[PDB]
Design a binder for this molecule. Structure first.
Ligand SMILES: Cc1ncc(C[n+]2csc(CCOP(=O)(O)OP(=O)(O)O)c2C)c(N)n1
Ligand SMILES: Cc1ncc(C[n+]2csc(CCOP(=O)(O)OP(=O)(O)O)c2C)c(N)n1
Ligand SMILES: [Cl-]
Ligand SMILES: [Cl-]
Ligand SMILES: [Cl-]
Ligand SMILES: [Cl-]
Ligand SMILES: [K+]
Ligand SMILES: [K+]
Ligand SMILES: [K+]
Ligand SMILES: [K+]
Ligand SMILES: [Mn+2]
Ligand SMILES: [Mn+2]
Lengths: 329, 370, 329, 370
């Protein structure tokens, strides 16, 4: 389908996407903290040697600077691939992302833009990351028209989605689930290929209930589907959202019109979490089809704890129990 | 003898704190006195008459437009305005020392750069009125100018955000082998923002061909500089980042021109940032240049009168035209949020269209394009 | 009920609250850009003269510094009342608010806190503010456990809610609707009084539909209620949410169990807006009572425009039309 | 003759950029050489034997604990650790020059300050293990220490955020007439953050009794200082903010002590900030102090051996105890988010309790308190 493949874990698939990008786009540069020696999660190994120190380089330790600097590169039309070392540390750049990058094209009447910016950042829980190496900030960014927010669930998906982000003519934030960096490998095409943005993927068809998640949590809901089938004889339709904004309203609504039930799950805290936007939209569009209340199985409304992580996360049991109750409603 | 990677320095065997020199700070570079007289002949740029007249007519035309739009604002004809009074020389002097294609990032005191670059009066007006002629499609507050043709990046309200952006554009210019420099203007208040520290440091470590132009007029809204910083203004910060730095008299168009011209030359040749801090008041740049013209025999009261009349007429003609144009179609509130309009955003646009069909009497649709 | 009153507009009621606070709390200080001469919206007039330059003072122009500095004052137990000049400019402080202020008590096991911090900021549309003097950022903050977010609809409400924020033992963001600063005055008690946080107010009882809003938008929904009564014979229950987080779930759900319909409105953009959280929660809790889909009438998913403002805002006609359709569903 | 409110300076009639002096930067203050010999007798603080022994045993005890916890981390007994190797002298030397009640803000290299302040080994361990004895209730990553009794504000992972907070606490101290100073530690990497520019500037304009202590060890993770800044380290930035500044040899506990003691004295008397940049490596502070002790006749090989044994035993005793304690009740993941638990948060806590009743077999409840 896509030419020769090799087994790659998620960090390798990121390197491959970045390599493909710099090979085909002579404007493209990669920068951030500690990117030059290959990055703290290895995502840029070999790239400075292959493409040159003027193209893969370290910045000072200043996230607001990293994003402002990336916006400026993109204003000249050059492809700027910025790294933020953990998603938890994207906040100092919030004003540059929200007030500047997201608004740049609109506010200038399209005289200027920063479409050729992509910000990539490790994201989500990692077992022991605690408050500042665990966060999933996508809902903060979801309320900001003018940026795209994209989160893959695997190495094949990561390379295709990241290539799309890099090439998309809008500033994109690409969140890489860091617990998957060295998890299982899968076959990934060596040459470039794209997966469309704003398109959810139905990974398993079903008829009784729709399950929606993104990132690592897709694997959790896949397992929940299996538990529901085996233990309850319930047929689950499993959907990976992939793009947080602009999101694929049509695919989710079509599924819920068919099943009549929806459960959305994410690691991020419940309140103001992106599940609230999906839930309220699906309720508006599929109201007459809803057999039970749409359920949200999310992280608790606390900071992300160190020793308590096993009790914090919306794991397969929490999702399964919510599902069981919804099936019984 | 010290072996530390973080700094290059000798040992000292006695405890001595380093004291800032604030009472006698970095001196203020001057070329002409308040009577318009050249002080040091070896520093005279000897600009030709046509260029110097252009500096003078750019400044005064800006001042004419300020007067009229400021009155327009007082009447609520436009919703907002910022004047350039006292700024005219720093902007026209520095713009004159740039290449036409050098990229400009700024804030809301930079209209003179556009005026020097022959930005049409009709388009300054179009932006303030948000009318159909505005390429910004009426989306921003007045005085938020931008021009892709004249390499003047659209102004945004959040202070200092353009500083690290300017550095990124300069890095990209370096790679492109542009032989282009970027200039970035900001006030002494804006220099307190974290983004200023980001831009100055990145420009030095990444070796970018950028001029940082700080306008120090002693105040940020109500805040005097005694509450803004305690070092020797902004120029004294440059050397701490490794940035070559100078302070100039912002009322002296020649001192500004000379410093900007030399900063541009070296920034582009060496790929290193330069910082110019221009001192102004918030003894005027226009007066001082007028005195100079009057010495060369290059101006006189008759020419001053005719130009005053001609410039008022040109500004009035643009003003009247701008007020009479319609505003853009309300549809334009939805485009350019992304390059391509997302289906869900198009849905919102269709919902406004349907709404206006039914409730349109309640909207001021009179003067919007249809 | 509350002792002697005087007519005050919203800026005056803010000054009164701040005056009352500094009179009764010798630790309290007020600081930010241009606060010393009385502020760009007059909210601090007279306070430096009355209480001293060490208590009401200007900072350098640096929002991240303002909030970090306020957190430090609060860490010593002193009351810190920080001003951010427009809510649009709160973003540079996002990391200090979200990573630091909100998490300070939790992450230290309550060994340290910044409960005595309050951040006040002008908020919402003003007719011609465009992208950066119009914003309503409450949904960005709603996803951050550990902060409170409070928005009043009037001078009486502003003084009582602000006094509560200042005295509450948690970092609070208090958003002042700037279009109301010099709007109509009303009677406001001269002496201090408190309005509880996390408590919505039913301002008009009704039986057919529940309307929820906050800030200036409360006045819009009050008018919508009147239009619905006069034009449709529809009885609306009008509710001012007042606190965005933690929000008063119980008052909203009780109302919807009674009426069976809900319309939520806010100036902020629809997507990821706080109406999504209210909608998804009400749907979970009041599912069997819902006669029609919960409707959200919000700003569009664009930056906030200059010349197009009259067409952007969710005005009384947009709300009325949504309501009419919901009544007919 | 210049009349500008923004700066105090003369005119100059020739164009001259100000060049940074980076090749011969601010010299490095030293008190003892690498052989532990005092270089300049007038600078000797002549600390008494008991205090100097305390400096030495604090450093070595920290080093003993580092060795053991670093090995524990390699085995996955704890999830994370940061050592203090090379940091021991800057932290113990500076802590010794402070008052016991002076408030400390820091980052993850500041454990030695707590060790000097007699923070129990059991509590360093409790935090790394997240066990029932941790007053932080197991919520943060290892090495994120805090102690209200010892005036050591809890560490957080985001770099530099504590810098403007430290300034606010110092402003409040000033008002309280504390006669207290705040010290704020950060690395040279962290100094690049916008919050560093915020803290330095606010401390100067608001006249705060604060010591900024920058640890320059030449690297921020993989990034050498050549990619971090281009001025003369961090000390050269101080004077640009109006901040009295000094650079010291961080391998010299006496130079650190002297500079911190004098900074504390003047900061508290004058209500002005001081910046100390301590140069280290990432010729060790412990070795250099040992040589000094050995000259005074204050230590010898027998005492070194007995102390090595005693310190290993004390650390081992704490280690074993820490590993055997249970973790806190999982309920504690809900408290202190706000002072009082919101009803909706209590609802989430009840939902976890119900969940664990049914699915508890699938959770590692073995070693959590019940
Ligand atoms: C981040 C941010 N904070 C605050 C403001 C409000 N503000 C608009 S202009 C100004 C003063 C700017 O002073 P300075 O940079 O000295 O420029 P000047 O107006 O003197 O030319 C302020 C505080 C803003 N636009 N952006
Ligand atoms: C805002 C933020 N960005 C990035 C990091 C990741 N990080 C943890 S330590 C470190 C290097 C810090 O260097 P420095 O301040 O020089 O301290 P040192 O480790 O040398 O003692 C980095 C980049 C972080 N914790 N916070
Ligand atoms: Cl502005
Ligand atoms: Cl600016
Ligand atoms: Cl850390
Ligand atoms: Cl730090
Ligand atoms: K892009
Ligand atoms: K700007
Ligand atoms: K509070
Ligand atoms: K920190
Ligand atoms: Mn100014
Ligand atoms: Mn370092």
């Amino acid at each position: 389908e896509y030419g020769q493949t090799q087994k790659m874990n998620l960090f390798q698939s990121v390197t491959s996407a970045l390599d493909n990008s710099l090979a085909k786009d002579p404007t493209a540069v990669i920068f951030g903290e500690d990117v030059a020696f290959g990055g703290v999660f290895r995502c840029t190994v070999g790239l400075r040697d292959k493409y040159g120190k003027d193209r893969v380089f370290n910045t000072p330790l200043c996230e607001q600077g990293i994003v402002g600097f990336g916006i400026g590169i993109a204003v000249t039309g050059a492809t700027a691939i910025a790294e933020i070392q953990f998603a938890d540390y994207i906040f100092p750049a919030f004003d540059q992302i929200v007030n500047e990058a997201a608004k740049y094209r609109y506010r200038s009447g399209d005289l200027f833009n920063c479409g050729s910016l992509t910000i990539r950042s490790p994201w989500g829980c990692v077992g022991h990351g605690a408050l500042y190496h665990s966060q999933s900030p996508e809902a903060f960014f979801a309320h900001c028209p003018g940026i795209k927010v994209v989160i893959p669930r695997s190495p094949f998906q990561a390379k295709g989605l990241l290539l799309s982000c890099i090439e998309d003519k809008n500033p994109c934030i690409f969140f890489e689930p860091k617990i998957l960096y060295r998890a299982a490998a899968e076959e990934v095409p060596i040459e470039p290929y794209n997966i469309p943005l704003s398109q959810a993927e139905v990974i398993q068809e079903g008829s009784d209930v729709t399950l929606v998640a993104w990132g690592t949590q897709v694997h959790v809901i896949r397992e929940v589907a299996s538990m529901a089938k085996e233990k309850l004889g319930v047929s689950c339709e499993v959907i990976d959202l992939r793009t947080i904004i602009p999101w694929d309203v049509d695919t989710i609504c079509k599924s819920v019109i068919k099943t009549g039930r929806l459960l959305i799950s994410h690691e991020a805290p419940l309140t103001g979490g992106f599940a609230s936007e999906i839930s309220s939209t699906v309720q508006e569009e599929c109201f007459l089809n809803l057999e039970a209340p749409i359920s949200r199985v999310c992280g608790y409304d606390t900071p992300f704890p160190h020793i308590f992580e096993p009790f914090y996360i919306p794991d397969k049991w929490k999702c399964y129990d919510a599902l069981r109750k919804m099936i019984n409603y | 003898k010290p072996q530390f990677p973080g700094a290059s320095a000798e040992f000292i065997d006695k405890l001595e704190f380093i004291q800032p020199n604030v009472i006698s700070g970095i001196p203020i570079y001057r070329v002409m006195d308040r009577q318009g007289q050249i002080i040091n002949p070896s520093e005279d740029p000897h600009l030709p008459k046509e260029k110097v007249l252009k500096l003078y007519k750019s400044m005064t035309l800006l001042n004419t437009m300020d007067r009229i739009l400021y009155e327009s604002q007082r009447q609520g004809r436009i919703s907002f305005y910022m004047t350039n009074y006292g700024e005219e020389g720093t902007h026209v002097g520095s713009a004159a020392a740039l290449d036409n294609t050098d990229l400009v990032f700024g804030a809301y005191r930079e209209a003179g750069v556009l005026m020097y670059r022959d930005y049409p009066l009709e388009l300054f007006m179009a932006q303030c009125y948000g009318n159909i002629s505005d390429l910004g499609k009426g989306r921003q507050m007045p005085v938020h100018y931008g021009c892709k043709e004249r390499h003047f990046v659209t102004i945004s309200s959040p202070l200092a955000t353009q500083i690290p952006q300017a550095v990124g554009a300069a890095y990209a210019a370096k790679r492109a082998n542009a032989n282009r420099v970027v200039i970035c203007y900001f006030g002494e208040g804006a220099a307190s923002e974290g983004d200023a520290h980001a831009g100055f440091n990145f420009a030095a470590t990444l070796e970018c061909p950028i001029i940082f132009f700080c306008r120090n007029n002693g105040y940020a809204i109500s805040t005097p500089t005694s509450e803004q910083y305690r070092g020797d203004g902004i120029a004294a910060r440059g050397p701490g980042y490794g940035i070559m730095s100078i302070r100039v008299d912002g009322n002296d168009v020649f001192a500004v021109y000379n410093a900007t011209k030399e900063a541009r030359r070296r920034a582009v040749a060496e790929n290193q940032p330069f910082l110019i801090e221009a001192m102004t008041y918030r003894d005027h740049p226009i007066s001082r240049l007028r005195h100079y013209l009057l010495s060369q025999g290059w101006w006189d009261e008759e020419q001053e009168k005719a130009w005053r009349k001609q410039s008022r007429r040109k500004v009035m003609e643009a003003f009247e035209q701008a007020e009479r144009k319609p505003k853009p179609n309300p549809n334009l509130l939805f485009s350019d949020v992304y390059q391509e309009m997302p289906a869900q955003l198009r849905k919102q646009q269709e919902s406004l269209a349907r709404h206006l069909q039914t409730y349109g009497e309640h909207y001021p649709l009179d003067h919007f394009d249809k």
